[PDB]
Design a protein around this ligand. Sequence first.
Ligand SMILES: C[C@@H](C(=O)O)c1cccc(C(=O)c2ccccc2)c1
Ligand SMILES: C[C@@H](C(=O)O)c1cccc(C(=O)c2ccccc2)c1
Ligand SMILES: [Ca+2]
Ligand SMILES: [Ca+2]
Ligand SMILES: [Ca+2]
Ligand SMILES: [Ca+2]
Lengths: 580, 576
Amino acid sequence: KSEIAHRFKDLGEEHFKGLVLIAFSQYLQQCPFDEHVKLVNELTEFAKTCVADESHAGCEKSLHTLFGDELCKVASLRETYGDMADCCEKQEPERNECFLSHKDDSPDLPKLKPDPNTLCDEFKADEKKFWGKYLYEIARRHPYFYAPELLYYANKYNGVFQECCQAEDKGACLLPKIETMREKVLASSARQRLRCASIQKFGERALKAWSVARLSQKFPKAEFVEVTKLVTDLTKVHKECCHGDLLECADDRADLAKYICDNQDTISSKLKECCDKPLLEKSHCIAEVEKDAIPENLPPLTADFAEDKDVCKNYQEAKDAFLGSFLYEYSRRHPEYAVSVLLRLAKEYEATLEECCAKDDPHACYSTVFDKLKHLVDEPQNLIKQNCDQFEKLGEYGFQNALIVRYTRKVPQVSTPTLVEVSRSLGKVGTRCCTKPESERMPCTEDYLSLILNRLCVLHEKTPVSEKVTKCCTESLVNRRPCFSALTPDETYVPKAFDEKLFTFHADICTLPDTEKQIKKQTALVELLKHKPKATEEQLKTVMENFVAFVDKCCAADDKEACFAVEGPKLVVSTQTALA
Amino acid sequence: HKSEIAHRFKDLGEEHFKGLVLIAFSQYLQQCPFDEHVKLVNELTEFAKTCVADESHAGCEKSLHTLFGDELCKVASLRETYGDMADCCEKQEPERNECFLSHKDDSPDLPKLKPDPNTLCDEFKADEKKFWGKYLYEIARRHPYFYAPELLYYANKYNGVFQECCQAEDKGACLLPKIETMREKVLASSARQRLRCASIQKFGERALKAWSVARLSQKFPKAEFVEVTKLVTDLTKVHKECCHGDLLECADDRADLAKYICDNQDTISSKLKECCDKPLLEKSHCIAEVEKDAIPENLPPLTADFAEDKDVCKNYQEAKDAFLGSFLYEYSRRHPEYAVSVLLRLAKEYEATLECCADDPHACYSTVFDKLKHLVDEPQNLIKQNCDQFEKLGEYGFQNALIVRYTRKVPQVSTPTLVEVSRSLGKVGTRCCTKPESERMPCTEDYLSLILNRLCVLHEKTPVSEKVTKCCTESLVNRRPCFSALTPDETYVPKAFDEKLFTFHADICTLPDTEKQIKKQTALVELLKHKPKATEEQLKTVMENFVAFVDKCCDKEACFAVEGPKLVVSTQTALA
Ligand SMILES: C[C@@H](C(=O)O)c1cccc(C(=O)c2ccccc2)c1
Ligand SMILES: C[C@@H](C(=O)O)c1cccc(C(=O)c2ccccc2)c1
Ligand SMILES: [Ca+2]
Ligand SMILES: [Ca+2]
Ligand SMILES: [Ca+2]
Ligand SMILES: [Ca+2]
């Protein structure tokens, strides 16, 4: 009768406290760590009270009710967060959707530069708080981070500091490990955000479809009804995470991990290795598991979904069940496809049935449906065949630079900091993907774009300025990459007026770290194309060069500032000659 | 009435009271977080209020050290953070406080602070006072001997720069110049107070007293010696109290002195009226840096009263310090141009000379006045050679020259001290050498005593060189000559070669400009430790070849990676 007692019992105090802490850090992103801790314990103490006495006053409230009551006691709330304190005026579930809406997906908080020595002492100073501070720093930065998975990563973090803090040159031991891990974490955020976006913007069934695709690939051996059960459970888990119900999300995720291990036979043979780890490690392992072998001799899809005479009758009888079935069959025997394409394929199959089952001889129309699809599979490979195999010549950094011009021309109205962050990430696919077996590029890249493109839609949808982008993001989820790739620059676009401040540079530029410097450098490329929408392709190879030669002189010459002072106006006036 | 904490709370009013208390904690517990110290200021501030209501309430009669220290001893994280410092709680006052003082870090190795005008302007308008307190905290924790009342004043100026400049468009361009100039005034100010503190601690009260007789007699040459004696004792008490952590009383006593001074401008100075009409902190600041009043018209020659006279040794033996002060009084009022360091040096000899009045005293001590003014003319050459030295090389080149000279003198000294010191010396070139040549000698004499003190104070903790200890401990007045006299000593056995010292990374390119120099000057230091007898011409070849390294590389990882080992072996061939 007490949701909070139940969750404290099911998860135990340590995890309970971490999740609860993750919750605050994700709602109240600009609040300080020591405060949120203050808020975690009393809620923990309170939870202890209702497990002792479950009929005590208030332990029968929902966790949203109880958690939200805490947020609404935050002294600095309207002062720190403003309009968010309006949320406190509402009733559940409205209060919580209001709070959710104020989650900053671009909290513009300070990048964490880790000094191995100053960190390792804190680690040994206090382990558990070290772990907590980790949960906090990542969650505030990714307000939709998959919670139980964040706990897993905090654990992994300590072990890296646990086992690399007894060294001489710690720093040489650490940085590589923590750089690799934070890459995994970035990805993990991007995925969960996509799962969140599908639900909010395309409804539950969009995410179900996605889950069907993923699981049917990994467990091609399992029966469709088995796969369905995993889908609803897993969807509920994500629906819960994406709504802030972290304790319930975590608890349910654990319950799902068990069911899966308890039923390996009907599901997969590659499970035997995961289902023998501790809970967090187990679930991560299950999520990353290798796909099982496809079953032996199976009827072609054409049989049950095209040639058969009763498809419209079967489809009309239970549309979603029937479509899920199609997605099941298609995916289990095609691990090579990206789940993104599979959805694209099923979305198509649905539209034709809608069309054809309405015509006079519906079977005449649909019999050919596998002729339209078998093309949708071919469309993507080419768009992989011109680029990563474009990519080798330019290399990565060059490639990103190639992309900024292309996308900026596509959608110039987009905020610069967005184009930069995005454009960078698209280029990073090559190092990410195109090194892979040429066979598995397509799932990898189509799967990464769906992540990067989502990031774009989520940044844009708040401060919306470009209709083409709204169109591509909003129209469909499966077709976002096609909608965006299909984009062309509009001669309607009126070029951005010149602002010296954009093209002016200071000694700070040299005193920058290597990467951020690129962004500060890449930002300017962005501004030019906004300024000169119809610029050409080779002067850029010269205009950047005078620039790369510019920064070197100044970073070289003695008076670190003076060159910038006199050199700087020169490049603009030269490059402003070359503007035509 | 019988409660010191009531007494100070009434005398200063709550706002100064709270800042000063925060300064104290911030100076004792330098590595503790700002909000923690805040919690401690209030608890003590509420308690303080209780004793003004009821002065007979329990504990209101305890000393401030009892009360402040009892608070230091409730900190849960004290031994974990500070180690032996938690031993201090086991002691009784006054031993507990002398123990806490001993753990004050003069080199707290805290993060250099880069102010981002947006982030700061956000904080400032957000909350004025916590912004104000946070300044007090960051400065105090970095200078645990900072002159407290003066620190409050600077907090005020900090906020005023933010009342302005933040209501602006390009905030950063309005701000950065202002906070940067002030950051110099504060740094200087710290070095001074660190000096006044060290004089007392290591040379006693009268040492601090002699300076003051000089400093004040210059400023108020109109005042009679007795008035000055009155000011001197008052002011010495002020600094003794600050230097001992007795901040509330320091502030309270300083104010009272500022008041007294305004009430007697007539008997003291004509240049006071512009100060004596400001708010309290500003007033005190202004009085301190006020312009020297004009010397009165025609007064007796010095030779007259201190030599030709028949009772010079006998009057002297009757009251040594008083008579010696009179000398310091009289000599100083008529030499506004001289450096206080020089006047003490002069007084120090005259004392050394006075110690000859021991068969026919009148005969020996008649020639003393030609000996002194030799001491004034002595310094002048090392100012031309250094200022002409500096003029040629520029600052940065000059600092590098200094780094080499001193690394030669005292190789055992820690690398970071040598670097920190030489730099500040080089800035003397820019600080003084620009002035009209007539007045170059005093200004240069004045900053050195500050910088040289900073060396003794850093070394005095982890003492590794017999040479500096001798000079730091010998005398306060003669520290400047002492150091000049030492020459690199063949006793020194060169430091074994360590590649870790001379390897370079891409960070060297990405550094702010200031650290950039420090990493190189650091590298330069370590070389002379390795090769003491390198020559005055090879090094510029090593530096020429060296700056001819970063230019190529500044890969980014691979060249440094191979270039660096190449340069190491180059400098290692031509090293002889
Ligand atoms: C999104 C991620 C997850 O939310 O964990 C995922 C992806 C693919 C398969 C599974 C899965 O089957 C699973 C179920 C229970 C616990 C762990 C993994 C999970
Ligand atoms: C050390 C500094 C100071 O302690 O402020 C200083 C220098 C010179 C003169 C005075 C002074 O006479 C004074 C007295 C009362 C309040 C303010 C200044 C003070
Ligand atoms: Ca933002
Ligand atoms: Ca429920
Ligand atoms: Ca130190
Ligand atoms: Ca006292």
